[model samples]
Target chain A: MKVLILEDVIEHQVRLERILDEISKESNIPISYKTTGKVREFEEYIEQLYFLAIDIHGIEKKGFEVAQLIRHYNPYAIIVFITSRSEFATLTYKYQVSALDFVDKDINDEMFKKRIEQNIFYTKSML
Target chain B: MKVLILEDVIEHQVRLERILDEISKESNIPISYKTTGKVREFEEYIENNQLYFLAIDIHGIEKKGFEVAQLIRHYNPYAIIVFITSRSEFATLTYKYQVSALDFVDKDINDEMFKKRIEQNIFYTKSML
Candidate 1:
């Protein structure tokens, strides 16, 4: 699978990459991914995607817009929103973007890793 | 784009993957693909595709080969269809299927020739889009 990680925070990006790396190795599923802090990069990569792991709070209101665009380009692409705010969770469903999961970044490491694993498993199952 | 390859022969499957890998790397296009030998597996995978690069062998066919292609074409109208066969006589019949096939690959040819044809098809598809 080709995944695009859209997170402005470098720390979060690194942590997400680590978790994804562990999941990929443990599951033995080959994943080619790229991380971008810029919304322009996200727009450029809109067409070439199977999965998108987006930080919903990145770059002001740009994250939601990026998600919408991704849905527009590839209707079947798996979307996972990662955010610290729980309030935006409802908006994900309201938008009808068909996101696979909404991940809370403020959660404990164990819980966060568990959610990541579940999301990866779902993605693998779809393939 | 996610591609499902339904070639039954192991050697052909490997060659197809290698060609796809080379095209993806050269064009900087990321492609996630799966190869299936079983007709049942192909039927299951038929629902989960966007850009299909089918290599169909019409002779001594399994699972109503042209009918399968037509079904895929119906679901994905803009799909890039390519027939892989030893006989060149079925060209007109492939066109009659109205699947908008891109090219035909001769199974009797060498690997290098097959690679060239695959490259041309890839380039042609890219240009069309």
Candidate 2:
């Protein structure tokens, strides 16, 4: 299965990679992903994606804008919003995009990882 | 502070104790708990427990685990609930059930993952208490 992670922070980009790597190996499901800040890069991915870790507020188009575009193409993608703080999470419901989870960057490291793990594990079960 | 384990399986009840005992010692927080598979014993608990961490598993009871949590929230609005189960797939139901769960742990995961997940919730409960 393929996943896309759209966070501009390089550190979390790496964290998401390791999380997926571990889940992929443990589940014995071969998973590949694309990580980037710009939507134009993956604009034509065209293949079905199993998960997307998008930071709802970002430099280019504020993540939800990116989500609206991504939503149009990949209607089935499991969208999880990553935010600096959880205040903007309320904006998700208004966007008309089906988001699966909301993760805050400000939570303790272990807590943050646990939320992401649950999101990925949930996606794995959808298969 | 008090913690409760609502697991039918003896081995998981033991596992829950092992993890909770360690947190009790490390945090210097006085903690006492009871484990039961029966709802009758579980019912008397909501009256007096504080800084609660009720780690529960599904099945083995007439009422499902989600409903068990609903009963807790109804009486004691401040319960810290964590569900330990083989059904990691139902983790999302924490939202549907409005249970305000701390985490849904996979009992089938490696011992390290299971311990860390429970330990995190135990420590979290202590702080909240």
Candidate 3:
């Protein structure tokens, strides 16, 4: 399945991309990765993906705005939010945008792979 | 039942309130009206009651028009959502907000017909509720 990961942090972006690549190979799922620092660009290409992983705190328009834009384009796409900030958690429900779980910033390799695998399994079943 | 109408134009607001009042009297429903230029105020007032109906205009935030409806769903999940936008671009996806129905208010829409549509919507929504 085609997946999109939107993150502004260079280090986080690299780590997320690598994690996805490893999971993709293990699952025999072909994946394409795209990273953007510009929130508007991410907003502009909302309908083009099956699933999305967004870093809320690093994005320009904030995660709520990104979710809104994504909903406007594709309402059914799986939304997985990743963020370092805990305060942003409440905002997600206020926006009524359900996310697939989030990962802490200091996530180790085991936790990172576990979350990604869990989300992929969950998303696969959802479809 | 109570409803919230968000419109920027004073004339349109007055017209909508009058129409809703007429419908309310006929249907024996109570209607509360609030008009604001700030979109945030609409979001803030959402948790006050179990909303029966909502009519939105795109005059507040041009870009985040649809987001308002999504946000409203957080406070009032079972409300009958409706959109009255001049843009006409994102009109079809009113259901994204779980909207009960939608009616576009063009600049040339007649007051009588608009009022009739409002009554019809209120009736339809109340029946479902």
Candidate 4:
């Protein structure tokens, strides 16, 4: 399945990409993704995506707004928002967005990878 | 601080309550909870008091667990959310619910690990004040 990752932080982007790559190698599932930081760039590329993985620090509309917009364009696309702050949980109502799960920044790599594997399996089952 | 544990499984409910009791013993903090499977009872209790911690098993809920979580978060923002589910990954619109941190108890520990994690969170909250 094709996944679009929109993360601003360089380190997290690299870490998430590395994990996905490992999942691809181990599971032999070829996953395609488009990564970018700027929201404007994402506006043009989001419609073609099947699943979206978003990592942002706060509950601001810029990220949440863009995610909501993406969902508007295509309702079926799976959206997952990853964040470091727990306050984002309070804003999920206004955005009208639902996600696969939110990965805590403090969580260990094993559980993080396990969640990714689960998501892959879920998406595959949907196909 | 009051904590409400909404786990239908008898074993897990006892284990979690015991762990909380241990935390109360170690620290001077007073923690108590009401456990039940009925959502209405839980909702009424939530209305009557302040909840600092909630440990729920998603597998038992009639509606989606995330939906229930959304209602709980609406009632209280500062409550610590801990969900114990075998299927840890679920896509819910309410992803931002009271889930402050995610931990898997696995029902393996003899209450020590659960006590430690809960106390650590309490300690962090205390220090922040």
TM-score of each: 0.47, 0.50, 0.47, 0.49
Quote model 3's TM-score. 0.47
Index of the highest-DockQ prediction = 4
- Tell me the interface RMSD of model 4, in angstroms: 12.2
Error of 2 at B26 (Å): 3.5
TM-score on 0 to 1 scale for chain A of candidate 1: 0.86
Residue-level lDDT of model 1, residues B60-104, one tens digit each, is 663245667778766654455566765555544553344434455
RMSD of 4: 13.2
| Model 1 chain B lDDT-worst window of ten | B91-100
lDDT for predicted candidate 1 compared with the true structure? 0.63
Each candidate's DockQ score against the native complex? Answer: 0.01, 0.03, 0.03, 0.07
Per-model interface RMSD values are 18.4, 12.3, 13.2, 12.2
Q: For residues B23-52, what per-residue lDDT tens digits would candidate 3 score against the true structure?
A: 888778777766664677776786453332
Candidate 1: docking tier: incorrect
Q: Could you tell me the TM-score of chain B in model 4?
A: 0.69
Residue runs of model 3 more than 4 Å from their true location after superposition? A47-61, B1-129
Candidate 2: where are CA atoms >4 Å away? A1-54, A59-127, B51-63
Query: What lDDT does each candidate get?
Result: 0.63, 0.63, 0.57, 0.58
- Candidate 4 per-residue lDDT, tens place, B1-129, comes to 656666666776787678777777779777767787666777887667333333344555433445666566556543444454334233232243423232333355445665776665455445434
Model 3, span A3-90: residue lDDT tens: 7776667788788778778878888777676677666676666532423334445443266567656654554555666766644543
